[PDB]
Structures are given as structure tokens and as C-alpha cells.
Amino acid sequence: KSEVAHRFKDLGEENFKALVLIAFAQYLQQCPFEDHVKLVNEVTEFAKTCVADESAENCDKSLHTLFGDKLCTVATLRETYGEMADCCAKQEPERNECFLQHKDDNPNLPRLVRPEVDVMCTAFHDNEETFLKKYLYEIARRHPYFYAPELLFFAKRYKAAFTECCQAADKAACLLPKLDELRDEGKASSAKQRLKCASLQKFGERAFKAWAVARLSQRFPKAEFAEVSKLVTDLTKVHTECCHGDLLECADDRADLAKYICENQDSISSKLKECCEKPLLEKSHCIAEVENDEMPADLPSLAADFVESKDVCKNYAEAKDVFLGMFLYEYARRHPDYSVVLLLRLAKTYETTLEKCCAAADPHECYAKVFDEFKPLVEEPQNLIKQNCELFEQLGEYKFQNALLVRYTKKVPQVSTPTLVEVSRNLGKVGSKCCKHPEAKRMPCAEDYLSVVLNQLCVLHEKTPVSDRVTKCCTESLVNRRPCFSALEVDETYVPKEFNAETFTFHADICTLSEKERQIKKQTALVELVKHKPKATKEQLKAVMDDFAAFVEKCCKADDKETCFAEEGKKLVAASQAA
């Protein structure tokens, strides 16, 4: 009784008010901060009413009803804040669904440039709780699918970094460091959770259960199948609740799962010892990031149970899901060197071969050669990674980003230029993150993280579809997304982009830029001129790009006031369309 009191008691008031603030920020991303704080105060005082007496006049309602009622106190400002008045006009489940379906992955929110370190330490120590609520509210409204318990862990490290380095000699050499690494890990955190929610919402929980079986058997190889199955069921419920807006239930169940894992370490893995001593948030984060355990040495081959046995078709028919779940578990525990998407491709190939061979006349002869169908599927990513990494170690991260940017702009010239720039930069970053790994586990690092970056290209393009190839590659099937995009070639059906009045913008504000903003500006110009000529652009885009670099260096080192950028910009647009 009184579900809201049950959540308040299990989570504690501090984690309660933080998770509710994250939920409000993720549902109304354009609502101001103070309105969210007022409604958070209201429902937590109401939750105190309910744990005081679980028979009070409104404590039996559902969390969605309570949060949706409090959210629609402000959510239909008829001026123009009425685009989500859709849901406030609905009720029951329809309104929550409407709320979920209105989450914006690329909102029009302004760039959060935050002030000098002294102003931050001042606003921090003036009121720590409002400073940290502001951090939560901003990250949650700009990342509406952010893993909520992980966000609590990020906020905890955020406040610890501020308490530490605001009482130092130089507040810059201590704070901005950890702030930037927190920001990088935050965007990696939310992109990974974005893939999880997209897989759940667009492919059902069967796809996530299979993905979880593969990943958990990779990491917990000494665990028995029933143990992995139990962990997979609980992990799928945690991420299902959380991707669907049930953040309090997401967090409470995640804590219960961390408690169960750390109570049964001896039947799961040998590498949970030091993570299982940490506090709640640190414990769950460490469990979710632990390295793969040592696999059992004398593991039998799998042909005896899945290829050579005469009960293959009978086991595939009487208990289909258990049989192939056991197959994926037995194949994933033996191959930590394979990526998860590859292991799911092999599992689906095994299932399809079993489908067509169990209907034939000599099934054993038919499915005895199923392990050969896996050779091309294993060879393709290994080649892709070795060639792209030996190209990366030649070019370096920045030029590797430019190479992937030209490649994918040739593949899908219709996709928005900013999204193209961001996805290719995040595509290039997998070279620095994984190519440096030993090839021992070079594939799971790269392809799985590629599945993350490409998923962002899906959800950013999903909201404004313009390329049918992106739509096909992202909707046909999850585990095949990387080959679909990899096998694409130049779009010969795309009519190029003529030089337009604002194809690019060059004022004096390009020299005073940081090193990343200037890379993004040049990469944006590179996207635009590849869109101007997708073919016949061998790699003499180098010629136009070096001419462009000579242009901005010249008109910057001049006595001008970007007057040079004006009529030497008309000279650039002339000399570039000729090439």
C-alpha cells in the first residue's frame, strides 16, 4: 500500500527528491528550473504525508498519475508552451505514453557555457543543494534518456569535485580537469543508455534479454545458465522501468540487484570483491563496469550439444527460447573476444539455419555445416577494425575523424550537417579508445561502441527523417546496423548542394576559438563542400580544405576587422566551386 511511501522509504529522501527532479526534467525539458523545484517539494511533502499514514486521502494512487497531475500544473502555458498540452489533456496510461513519446533528443536548449571558476565556487557554497539541483536539472533536460541512478552517481562526484578543488590554491587547475572528464563520461553514459532504451522500445524485451545474456555470459563465464538467466531478467526489468519513466522503481530494483550480485559473488564472478565493498552508487557503477572474469579452461566444444547431437531439432522445437538462450550463453562465455552484436548475429544465423534444416529430409547433414556460416560473419568486423585502426594510427584522431566524416557524408548526404559532424567525431573517437587495446578484446570495444554512435545517428535522424538509407539501416534490425552502414557506398541519386548564401559563415570569431570549436567549424565546411560534390572528390578535398586553411590564416593575421573575410570569402567560394 501507498507505493509512493514504499519508494520513499526504500530510496531515502535525498535520492527520492533527486530522482523525482530528474523525472520532471526529462518529461518537461523546456520547463524552468524553479517550477520543477516547487513541484518536487510538493510531491516529497506529499510522500511524507503518505509514509506518515499509508491510508491518507490520495496515497493509494499510482506514481504516474501523481507525477503527471503535478506536472500538468504548468505544462499547458497556452502562449506556445502547449505543444505538450497533448498529454495534459489525456489521462491514465495514454498521458504517460504521450509524455514519453514527446522526449526530445536534440532540444532547442541553449549551450550551457558555464562561468568562471570563482563564480562557480561562489554559487556553489552559497547554496550547495540548489547548485546540485541545477546540475541535475540541466543534464536531465538535455539527456532525457539518462540512466537515472548513474546520474545520481555523477552528481555525487560533481559535488565532491567542487568541495575538494574550491578550497585549493588555484581553483582552475583542479576543477575544470575533473569537470571535463565528468562531462565526457556523462555523454558516454547517456549514449549507452540511449541504445538500451531504443533497443527496448523499438525491438521488444526479447532483443534486450538476448543482448543481456550475451554481455553477462561474456563477463560472468563461471556463472551457470540459471544464474545468468536470473540476472538477465532482473537487469531487463531495471532498464525497462527506467526507459519507461519509472525512475524510482528503476533505482530501487537496481539496488536490489546489486545486493543480490554481491551476496552471490561466489556463483557469479571472481572480480566483484572490491566493487562489492563500495557505497550504493559506487557499488552499482563498479558492478556495471567490471572487467570480464577468467573463463573456465577445459570448456567442451559446442558441436556436441548444438551441431552433432541428434536432439537438435527436438530441443529447438520443444523449448525454443531456452535452447537458443543456452546456445548464446555457451558461445558468449567462450568468446569475450567477439563483440555482442556479432554474437547475436551468430545466434540468429544458428536459429535461421535450424529453421530451414529442421524442415528438410536429412536435418543432421543440413545443420552439421552451420559453424561455417559463422566464418564470414566473424571475418568482416575483424577486417573492418584492423584496416580502420591501421588507418587511424597513420592519420591520428582528427584526420581520422575527417576521413570518416567524408565517408559517411558520401554515404548519406541528406543527413543534417551538425549531426553528421557529431556522429563522425564520435565515430573517430573509437579509434583512440579501442585501437590502442590489444586485439585480445579489440572487437568488443569498437563494434559495441560503434553500435552506440550509430544509434545516436538513428535517434537524431529519427526526429527529422531525410535519408531513406538511414531509416532502412536503423529500422531493419538492431544487430545488423553496423554492417548496413558499413556496406553503403556513395549516393549517386543525391543532387549536390549549390553554393548558397549561407553555406558557410566566416567572421573574425574563428581565431579566438578553442581547438575543438575550430575543428568543428572546419569539419562543418568539409561536410558542406562534400555535399556540394559527393563524387569526383577523390581526396582533393584536401586542396579545397588547404585553400580554406590558408584563407582563415591570412584574413586572421591581417590588420583587418574580418573585412578580409568578406571579399576574400567571395574569392574562396569562387576558387572552390572550380575544383
Side-chain angles (χ1 to χ4, degrees), residues 325-342:
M326 288 198 65
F327 164 80
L328 180 53
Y329 151 74
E330 291 279 352
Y331 216 107
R333 68 189 309 209
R334 288 168 174 80
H335 289 270
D337 57 313
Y338 289 180
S339 67
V340 176
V341 291
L342 165 65

Side-chain angles (χ1 to χ4, degrees), residues 156-166 168-170 172-356:
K156 172 173 172 177
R157 310 157 65 185
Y158 190 71
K159 83 156 304 183
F162 260 78
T163 57
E164 167 187 6
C165 300
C166 280
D170 173 28
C174 194
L175 183 65
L176 311 187
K178 26 191 68 178
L179 283 199
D180 286 354
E181 172 67 351
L182 279 189
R183 167 192 51 81
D184 298 313
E185 194 194 309
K187 273 153 75 132
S189 207
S190 86
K192 194 51 175 202
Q193 187 66 18
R194 192 64 186 96
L195 168 68
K196 289 191 179 57
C197 296
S199 311
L200 274 172
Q201 291 179 26
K202 287 158 201 170
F203 303 95
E205 86 178 32
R206 272 179 162 271
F208 195 96
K209 283 190 72 176
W211 176 92
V213 163
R215 183 82 184 105
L216 264 44
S217 313
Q218 269 188 346
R219 302 204 336 218
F220 305 138
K222 283 175 240 150
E224 251 176 29
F225 176 67
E227 197 59 59
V228 186
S229 304
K230 197 259 184 302
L231 296 174
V232 156
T233 288
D234 295 333
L235 188 55
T236 313
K237 176 201 260 234
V238 165
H239 281 283
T240 303
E241 277 156 345
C242 211
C243 294
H244 287 240
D246 318 311
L247 309 193
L248 313 169
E249 306 95 309
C250 158
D252 190 17
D253 286 312
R254 183 227 213 188
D256 293 326
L257 177 56
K259 176 171 176 287
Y260 175 80
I261 291 170
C262 289
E263 279 176 336
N264 303 268
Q265 335 180 9
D266 272 342
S267 57
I268 295 172
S269 147
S270 147
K271 314 216 154 308
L272 303 151
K273 39 191 41 75
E274 271 197 309
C275 303
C276 284
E277 293 157 354
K278 267 117 167 56
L280 184 78
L281 302 180
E282 277 98 344
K283 190 167 68 170
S284 284
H285 176 95
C286 204
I287 290 164
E289 208 137 305
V290 81
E291 67 170 344
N292 309 15
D293 193 10
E294 270 75 51
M295 96 168 58
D298 291 19
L299 269 193
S301 188
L302 281 195
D305 266 25
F306 301 104
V307 170
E308 306 163 349
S309 147
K310 293 192 174 306
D311 292 338
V312 172
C313 286
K314 307 77 217 168
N315 295 340
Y316 175 62
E318 294 295 337
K320 188 195 91 164
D321 298 304
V322 168
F323 186 64
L324 308 162
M326 288 198 65
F327 164 80
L328 180 53
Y329 151 74
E330 291 279 352
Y331 216 107
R333 68 189 309 209
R334 288 168 174 80
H335 289 270
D337 57 313
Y338 289 180
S339 67
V340 176
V341 291
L342 165 65
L343 269 156
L344 296 171
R345 292 186 213 112
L346 305 191
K348 279 307 293 176
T349 290
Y350 180 75
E351 178 181 358
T352 285
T353 293
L354 280 204
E355 213 92 272
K356 74 113 170 163

Side-chain angles (χ1 to χ4, degrees), residues 20-21 23-29 31 35-36 39 42-43 64-76 84 88 95-96 99:
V20 172
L21 174 65
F24 287 164
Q26 289 175 345
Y27 274 129
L28 291 187
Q29 314 170 245
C31 198
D35 295 64
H36 278 328
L39 307 153
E42 280 155 348
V43 290
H64 278 160
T65 316
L66 310 172
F67 296 164
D69 288 337
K70 272 279 165 288
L71 273 168
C72 288
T73 54
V74 279
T76 83
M84 225 171 311
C88 288
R95 138 183 94 174
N96 194 247
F99 268 138

Side-chain angles (χ1 to χ4, degrees), residues 14 33 54 56 106 216 227 236-237 277 305 311 314 323 344 371 413 417 426 471-472 499 511 518 527 538 555 565:
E14 179 174 36
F33 173 70
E54 317 183 21
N106 185 30
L216 264 44
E227 197 59 59
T236 313
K237 176 201 260 234
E277 293 157 354
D305 266 25
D311 292 338
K314 307 77 217 168
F323 186 64
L344 296 171
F371 274 175
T417 288
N426 296 341
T471 305
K472 184 182 190 185
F499 266 120
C511 324
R518 78 148 213 100
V527 164
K538 323 96 202 152
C555 290
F565 282 81

